[PDB]
Structure formats: C-alpha cells, structure tokens
C-alpha cells in the first residue's frame, strides 16, 4: 500500500451571510421614540407616523410594525386603552 501526504491548510468553513440585523429593528426604535414623546397614540396614527418616518432609507410596511409593537406590549413597553384596542399607551 501507499500512504503519501498532501497539501492541507484551508479549513475555516465560514460563510458570513447574516451576522446582524437592522431592518426589523429601526422600526422598533422609531415606535419607542414617538411613544416616549407622544405617550398616547392610536394604531393607524402610530403606523402612519413610523411608516413615514422611515422612508428616507427603505419602504417599511405596517406588517412588521404591528408585530413589533405586539411584542413591546408584552415586554412592558407599550399598552392598550380600556375603551378601544386600536389605541395604545406608553408604559415603559
């Protein structure tokens, strides 16, 4: 039989396709900044504001916004009024 050697060296096995994010974060910070100064704001009003405040870069959709806010309320960040659900209230 025969063993023989070769030329080994490269074996990092790296890719680097998705390290960090931002698209699903920039919209989250916008809602916090507004709710901090506005305190109380409706759903549409909050969406129309954030959706318009983040147009210079990309075209965000209420979709991610509705989901992002849904998490804040559970994270003791935002809240809803007893009268209507569409209405929100800062509680952070």
Domain chopping of the chain, boundaries: 1-92
Q: How was this structure determined?
A: NMR
What is the distance, to the nearest Å, from the Cα of residue 5 to the centroid of all Cα atoms in its chain? 52
- Which tokens in the block code for residue 46? 């909050």
- As beta bridge partners, residue 74 has none
Direct distance between the N- and C-terminal alpha carbons of the chain, in angstroms, rounded to an integer: 73
Q: Going by CATH, does the domain composed of 1-92 fall within 1.10.10.10?
A: yes
Do 61 and 84 contact (CB within 8 A), yes or no? no
Write b or e for each residue in 46-81: b if 16 or more Cβ atoms lie within 10 A of its Cβ, otherwise e: bbebbbeebeeeeebebeebeebbeebeeeebbbee
């Amino acid at each position: 039989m025969a063993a023989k050697q070769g030329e080994s060296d490269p074996e990092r096995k790296e890719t680097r396709q998705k390290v960090d994010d931002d698209r699903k974060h920039e919209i989250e910070a916008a809602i916090v900044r507004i709710m901090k100064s506005r305190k109380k704001m409706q759903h549409n009003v909050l969406v129309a504001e954030v959706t318009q405040q983040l147009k210079a870069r990309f075209l965000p959709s209420p979709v991610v916004i509705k989901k992002r806010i849904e998490g804040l309320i559970e994270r003791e960040y935002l809240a809803r009024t007893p009268e209507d659900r569409k209405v929100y209230t800062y509680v952070a």
